[PDB]
């Protein structure tokens, strides 16, 4: 029954576990995890317990064990195929992103603008969206959607028909996709607006 | 009282919708029309608007223009915010070229620690060294789009805080440490990527 927020905190806990490891720390605790993640110790334990990670009495959690557990729950211990649709300014930027990690592998780059289709990129070349159906099935599970707002939906349509499994949407719009498809939004205009609201209303936050 | 964080997000959606209705010429909308377009009950819509005071009782339908104005004022979109980007890497450079910031968000600075980047002209400006935040932020830059590698994020955020920034739209995969008088919003695309991973492996859950 896990709430959507918990999953986002796990992600944060895991990032924290990676930093602890790099520092050579073997054991951590809910108190420490909470301090570094800005949430109550109780919350940390509540989140972890959802999935069965409890740790050891008066000792806490073993860093590498919890890390293995979280990376498994979050599916980060798999290799996911990725693609970018919309090789504009942001798309080209994400193509050169050096922090995808070992968990996410760019296996395609697509666009409809002929000026872009054919252009060489790190990891390959830009292909026309028309080729999505002979590139996605069994090769690309996630697609980063980076096209203008007025084109996102239609692009998502191609993606879905092509057999995509998940879409990370950067367009400021709500995509209509079948329920077998996962969608997650990265809308920074909304983020900017929430910041504006928060600046004017300090007691709120 | 005090709006739920979830409502603020919906108001943003409602506004984007009204904007689109104004463009279509539609003059009168309603809680049921707004709800369907935003995919929520009309009750939710009335409830979100409830957190805000009105002259008599709210609710026949809404006049697009009037509702639009109201929501913009609530969200602070009727003000002109000064923005800047810190970390002119591939992502920061893309954000700098973004043409859809609107009339509400105005870029007034671009900063990086790499001396090999200072001097570079960019849409509407030039890259300056971070050492200049204290001279360029006061009085004209309230929001900072932070786009530096994960390991320099907290450091850069400290300079920004010391420079007098009022808000940080953080793109780095970390939880920033900042005084409570400084607002922070995270745009974590890697976390979204991980959220997708989880969602694809657990369909019934969603
Ligand atoms: Ca203007």
UniProtKB/Swiss-Prot annotation, chain B:
Subcellular localization(s) per the UniProt record: Cytoplasm
Q: Select a single GO molecular function from the record's annotations and give it.
A: DNA-binding transcription factor activity
Record's protein name: Redox-sensing transcriptional repressor Rex
Asked whether the UniProt record includes NAD among its keywords, one would answer: yes
On assembly, the entry states: Homodimer.
- What InterPro entries would the database entry show? CoA-bd, NAD(P)-bd_dom_sf, Rex_DNA-bd_C_dom, Tscrpt_rep_Rex, WH-like_DNA-bd_sf, WH_DNA-bd_sf
Q: Name one Pfam family in it.
A: CoA_binding
Q: Which UniProt keywords apply?
A: Cytoplasm, DNA-binding, NAD, Repressor, Transcription, Transcription regulation
User: Gene name on record?
Assistant: rex
**Positions of the DNA-binding region:** 13-52
Concerning SUPFAM superfamilies, the annotation shows: NAD(P)-binding Rossmann-fold domains (SSF51735), Winged helix' DNA-binding domain (SSF46785)
Q: Which family does it belong to?
A: Belongs to the transcriptional regulatory Rex family.
Task: Cite the binding residues for NAD(+).
Answer: 87-92
To which species is this protein native? Thermus thermophilus (strain ATCC BAA-163 / DSM 7039 / HB27)
Any GO BP annotation: response to redox state
A single GO CC term for this protein reads: cytoplasm
Query: What does this protein's UniProt record list under function?
Result: Modulates transcription in response to changes in cellular NADH/NAD(+) redox state.
């Amino acid at each position: 029954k896990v709430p959507e927020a918990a999953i986002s905190r796990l992600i944060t806990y895991l990032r924290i576990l990676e930093e602890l490891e790099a520092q050579g720390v073997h054991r951590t605790s809910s108190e420490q995890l909470g301090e570094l993640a800005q949430v109550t110790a109780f919350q940390v334990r509540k989140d972890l317990s959802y999935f069965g990670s409890y740790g050891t009495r008066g000792v806490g959690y073993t860093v590498p064990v919890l890390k293995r557990e979280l990376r498994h729950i979050l599916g980060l211990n798999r290799k996911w195929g990725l693609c970018i649709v919309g090789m504009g300014d942001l798309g080209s930027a994400l193509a050169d992103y050096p922090g995808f990690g070992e968990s996410f592998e760019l296996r395609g780059f697509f666009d409809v603008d002929p000026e872009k289709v054919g252009r060489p990129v790190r990891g390959g070349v830009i292909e026309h969206v028309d080729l999505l159906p002979q590139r996605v099935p069994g090769r690309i599970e996630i697609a980063l959607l980076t096209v203008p707002r007025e084109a996102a939906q239609k692009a998502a349509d191609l993606l879905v028909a092509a057999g995509i499994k998940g879409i990370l949407n950067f367009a400021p719009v709500v995509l209509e996709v079948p329920k077998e498809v996962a969608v997650e939004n990265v809308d920074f205009l909304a983020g900017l607006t929430r910041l504006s609201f928060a600046i004017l209303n300090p007691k709120w936050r």
